[PDB]
């Protein structure tokens, strides 16, 4: 096929998005690789497409979708923003801008061996596939398993919980891929973790109530980027804390990346507020991404901006 | 007719509605429908009454899904209904329970819920009033009750898969609940069945104080989870909601309790988050029938304990 006749607006199988990925690469190789971060826990290759116009280790954008895998939207969303970096770059001035000084790295299927359960076996499956000890239920809640208040009030210990925190901070191979990679990477300057649904904007902190230091920043970083998000269709985000706007949660993923000095650390939650919730219509899917990139686009400005 | 109906399927509340009327015609000496109010969207709440005789009888309350994506509670219920009028007079055991005791089975306690996971979304929850201010839709019907509302264990946020609503027993479909059961004022036990988690449960979910009769129920809840299992060998647990699951305020057995009726109980019925609310068809019978064996077992307790 080709990246220009792929169904955007279609959801698709794990084979799929991975098919997209190497034709991705191979229709944009100067631009364009794929990296792999890892494995999960039942083998499969965990894949970070990395954009690049040069350097050796650039400032970076990281974006991840799909970390939970029933939020469908977001994959696709994933795949939508890969094939438009390629089209804009070089051809929008704002875009060329961003990467010409900056890297963006997607990681476009956060969760594998859950997405290909939420289509073999269970839609609504949420969590990773891993085996707990003592337990005959199954999965960890990759964003309770991070090393920022793990533990603590905000996750469930109970290994049958939608939000069972795991035995120790990093067990998920999914999670300390990642920690992994940005720890090597060392110069990551926005992370920007992507979810459904409710329709939010967050920054940290999910585990505690005391604001972040750069709250001020982000608040106003915030309510920039939700204008542009409402600009194309008029969809309205609200935004704060993790622990004000929708509740408390700890060893999450953003609480962790500030902590190791990743400033515009944020969480989007896509479409809609609940009437499908996460069985968000395929028709929506595009929407969802275009007003969702006028918001990415704004954080990568500021990124950009503030060095 | 209910002797053709195919009880390993799931069906939509037309379906389900016109199966009530075939049961009532087919046993008309056995088994009435009540309408005990109207949904938000005015939709009929239907309560099948099976009964022997009597004048206002002891009775046991069963209702099925309350929380409209618990396909398999309604589809249970169903199965429990066609199991009630089989059994009467043919089992000697069950008939000896019908013949003291009344049976309040509500199948579809949440109809427009029900109707939402059909039509729109398979995994809505809560009802489906209208708030104010909000983009939401729905009240969840389990923080709604008059014990502890409003309390830790609901959210406020209307937008919350736990929204408690303005205030106790705003929502049309647990008043008319409510008012049944002070109306009737003679039920003994009060079973609200849900899933998943294979979890059966007493009261508190608000506060972790024991109920005055635990030892009873948890003895009581011992022995039902063990006639569940001796049939396919599933296994549930069982304890305190509080305990055995997490803290829930509003919720509708600490209610129940909080009136007096000493057996109120909660499933949460197969499985324990494989297939979670998308339970195959295949599992529906089997699930059915081991919780009938639990259900037996409180019912059979209730009959022998005024
Ligand atoms: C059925 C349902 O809606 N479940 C919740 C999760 C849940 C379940 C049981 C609980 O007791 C508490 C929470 C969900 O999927 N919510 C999704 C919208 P989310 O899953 O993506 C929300 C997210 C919090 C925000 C966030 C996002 C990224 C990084 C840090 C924080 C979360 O709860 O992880
Ligand atoms: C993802 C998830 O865990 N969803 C929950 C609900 C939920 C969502 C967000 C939260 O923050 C907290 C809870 C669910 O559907 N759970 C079902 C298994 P349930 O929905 O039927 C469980 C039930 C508690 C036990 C109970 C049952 C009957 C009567 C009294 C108490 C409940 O939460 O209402
Ligand atoms: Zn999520
Ligand atoms: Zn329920």
Same mark, same amino acid.
């Given at each position: 096929?080709?990246?220009?006749?792929?169904?955007?607006?279609?959801?698709?199988?794990?084979?799929?998005?991975?098919?997209?990925?190497?034709?991705?690469?191979?229709?944009?190789?100067?631009?364009?690789?794929?990296?792999?971060?890892?494995?999960?826990?039942?083998?499969?290759?965990? @894949?970070?497409?990395? #954009?690049?116009?040069?350097?050796?280790?650039? %400032?970076?954008?990281?974006?991840?979708?799909?970390?939970?895998?029933?939020?469908?939207?977001?994959?696709?969303?994933?795949?939508?923003?890969?094939?438009?970096?390629?089209?804009? @770059?070089?051809?929008?001035?704002?875009?060329?801008?961003?990467?010409?000084?900056?890297?963006?790295?997607?990681?476009?299927?956060?969760?594998?061996?859950?997405?290909? #359960?939420?289509?073999?076996?269970?839609? =609504?499956?949420?969590?990773?596939?891993?085996?707990?000890?003592?337990?005959?239920?199954?999965?960890?809640?990759?964003?309770?398993?991070?090393?920022?208040?793990?533990?603590?009030?905000?996750?469930?210990?109970?290994?049958?919980?939608?939000?069972?925190?795991?035995?120790?901070?990093?067990?998920?191979?999914?999670?300390?891929?990642?920690?992994?990679?940005?720890?090597?990477?060392?110069?990551?300057?926005?992370?920007?973790?992507?979810?459904?649904?409710?329709?939010?904007? =967050?920054? %940290?902190?999910?585990?505690?109530?005391?604001?972040?230091?750069?709250?001020?920043?982000?608040?106003?970083?915030?309510?920039?980027?939700?204008?542009?998000?409402?600009?194309?269709?008029?969809?309205?985000?609200?935004?704060?804390?993790?622990?004000?706007?929708?509740?408390?949660?700890?060893?999450?993923?953003?609480?962790?990346?500030?902590?190791?000095?990743?400033?515009?650390?944020?969480?989007?939650?896509?479409?809609?507020?609940?009437?499908?919730?996460?069985?968000?219509?395929?028709?929506?899917?595009?929407?969802?991404?275009?007003?969702?990139?006028?918001?990415?686009?704004?954080? =990568?400005?500021?990124?950009?901006?503030? %060095?």
């Amino acid at each position: 096929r080709s990246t220009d006749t792929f169904n955007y607006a279609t959801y698709h199988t794990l084979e799929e998005i991975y098919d997209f990925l190497d034709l991705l690469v191979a229709e944009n190789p100067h631009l364009v690789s794929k990296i792999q971060i890892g494995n999960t826990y039942e083998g499969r290759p965990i @894949y970070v497409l990395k #954009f690049s116009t040069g350097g050796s280790k650039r %400032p970076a954008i990281w974006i991840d979708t799909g970390i939970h895998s029933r939020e469908w939207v977001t994959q696709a969303s994933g795949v939508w923003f890969a094939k438009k970096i390629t089209q804009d @770059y070089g051809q929008d001035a704002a875009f060329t801008a961003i990467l010409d000084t900056l890297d963006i790295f997607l990681e476009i299927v956060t969760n594998p061996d859950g997405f290909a #359960f939420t289509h073999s076996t269970n839609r =609504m499956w949420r969590k990773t596939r891993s085996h707990t000890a003592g337990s005959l239920c199954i999965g960890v809640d990759p964003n309770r398993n991070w090393d920022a208040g793990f533990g603590l009030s905000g996750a469930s210990s109970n290994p049958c919980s939608e939000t069972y925190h795991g035995k120790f901070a990093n067990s998920e191979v999914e999670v300390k891929s990642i920690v992994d990679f940005v720890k090597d990477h060392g110069n990551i300057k926005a992370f920007i973790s992507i979810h459904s649904y409710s329709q939010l904007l =967050m920054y %940290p902190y999910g585990y505690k109530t005391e604001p972040v230091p750069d709250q001020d920043e982000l608040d106003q970083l915030s309510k920039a980027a939700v204008t542009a998000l409402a600009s194309l269709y008029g969809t309205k985000f609200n935004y704060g804390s993790i622990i004000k706007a929708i509740y408390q949660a700890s060893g999450s993923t953003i609480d962790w990346t500030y902590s190791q000095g990743i400033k515009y650390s944020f969480t989007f939650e896509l479409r809609d507020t609940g009437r499908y919730g996460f069985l968000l219509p395929a028709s929506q899917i595009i929407p969802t991404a275009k007003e969702t990139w006028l918001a990415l686009l704004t954080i =990568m400005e500021h990124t950009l901006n503030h %060095p």
